[PDB]
Amino acid sequence: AQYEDGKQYTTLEKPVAGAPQVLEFFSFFCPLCYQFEEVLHISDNVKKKLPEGVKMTKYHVNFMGGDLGKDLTQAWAVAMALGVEDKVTVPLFEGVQKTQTIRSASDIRDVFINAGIKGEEYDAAWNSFVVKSLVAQQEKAAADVQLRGVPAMFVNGKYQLNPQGMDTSNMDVFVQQYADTVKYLSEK
Amino acid sequence: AQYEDGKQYTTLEKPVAGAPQVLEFFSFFCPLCYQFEEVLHISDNVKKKLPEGVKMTKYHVNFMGGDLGKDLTQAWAVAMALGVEDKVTVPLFEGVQKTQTIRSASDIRDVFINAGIKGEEYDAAWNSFVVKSLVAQQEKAAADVQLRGVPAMFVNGKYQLNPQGMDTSNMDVFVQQYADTVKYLSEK
Numbered sequence: 001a002q003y004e005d006g007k008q009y010t011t012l013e014k015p016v017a018g019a020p021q022v023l024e025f026f027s028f029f030c031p032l033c034y035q036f037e038e039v040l041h042i043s044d045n046v047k048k049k050l051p052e053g054v055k056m057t058k059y060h061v062n063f064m065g066g067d068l069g070k071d072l073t074q075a076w077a078v079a080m081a082l083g084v085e086d087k088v089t090v091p092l093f094e095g096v097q098k099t100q101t102i103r104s105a106s107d108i109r110d111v112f113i114n115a116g117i118k119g120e121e122y123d124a125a126w127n128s129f130v131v132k133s134l135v136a137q138q139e140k141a142a143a144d145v146q147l148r149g150v151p152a153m154f155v156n157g158k159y160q161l162n163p164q165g166m167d168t169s170n171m172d173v174f175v176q177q178y179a180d181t182v183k184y185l186s187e188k
Numbered sequence: 189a190q191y192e193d194g195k196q197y198t199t200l201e202k203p204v205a206g207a208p209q210v211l212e213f214f215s216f217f218c219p220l221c222y223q224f225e226e227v228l229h230i231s232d233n234v235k236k237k238l239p240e241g242v243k244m245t246k247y248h249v250n251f252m253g254g255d256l257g258k259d260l261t262q263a264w265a266v267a268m269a270l271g272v273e274d275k276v277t278v279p280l281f282e283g284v285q286k287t288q289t290i291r292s293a294s295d296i297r298d299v300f301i302n303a304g305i306k307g308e309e310y311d312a313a314w315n316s317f318v319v320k321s322l323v324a325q326q327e328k329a330a331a332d333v334q335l336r337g338v339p340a341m342f343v344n345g346k347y348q349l350n351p352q353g354m355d356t357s358n359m360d361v362f363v364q365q366y367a368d369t370v371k372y373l374s375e376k
Contacts, residue, residue: 099223169259170292172291172292
């Protein structure tokens with residue numbers, strides 16, 4: 001075939017029911033995740049090729065960055081609850097990997113405040129139970145697929161993208177090959 | 189300051205003979221490298237405190253950015269061969285990470301042409317023996333020190349700077365501590 005199991009994607013031995021249509025996992029400490037987001041813009045390009053209605057979910061993971069890793073998963077939950085993902089993704093990635101100015105939960109908070117989120121608004125969300133359940137959903141989703149590495153992307157809780165089976169000479173071609181595979185899998 | 193093995197620097201288990209006095213590794217895809225170069229000016233500050241007769245060598249790595257990473261390593265060789273390092277370093281960092289106008293080998297050529305290098309000259313340099321030699325040199329150098337990641341700097345092939353063991357609190361103090369550590373190690 002043109003799309004082979006084991007080449008551009010892998011089929012999960014134990015499929016997951018009730019999983020979001022397109023689920024992406026990442027970590028602000030993950031180098032390749034930085035490339036995918038800031039340079040390649042994977043998520044955006046994938047979104048612009050998905051059929052009408054198909055929803056995309058992006059979750060943060062706990063297994064990198066120790067203590068800060070967990071703080072970031074909670075911060076991501078806050079970003080989701082408040083709907084400010086598009087305002088804090090870049091400064092969080094850069095804060096951790098470019099300028100190395102993010103070293104504690106306090107530093108994470110500064111980013112949100114700088115990005116325009118009010119202090120009291122951030123603190124309320126940070127301590128909310130709505131955020132606590134969001135953290136739990138992120139953890140459960142990772143558990144359902146036995147995730148042990150990022151970046152990762154699953155389609156219909158059954159297939160996992162395999163970017164190792166794609167050409168990386170030209171970045172634009174790589175991105176489109178990636179996006180087309182997600183489209184193919186979503187209607188499969 | 190007080191310099192201690194395991195703290196501000198590390199001693200190599202297996203020393204590399206013939207290594208440049210001050211060897212620095214980076215990648216145009218590396219975020220912190222971009223920071224070191226344009227904001228901190230780490231290299232400049234290190235040069236400003238190096239003794240008489242001390243030369244700095246800077247090499248590019250392959251393990252980042254897939255196949256384009258290899259092309260950038262060859263383009264860096266061309267920059268060294270033509271002696272235009274100071275003219276193209278920032279434009280290449282911006283093209284890859286900021287403006288994102290560099291997506292394939294062809295886009296790199298444009299950077300050089302825009303800086304004043306004739307296309308014929310760039311193309312001739314690109315396929316030259318001097319360049320193929322420089323590319324091999326950069327690859328061997330990384331292999332010899334078993335480079336895990338970048339940015340990285342080695343002194344006299346025996347010591348490796350450990351910025352993680354340095355005072356990150358104040359960037360101005362950090363920069364000078366980094367430079368002083370290099371100076372201290374060069375005469376040891």
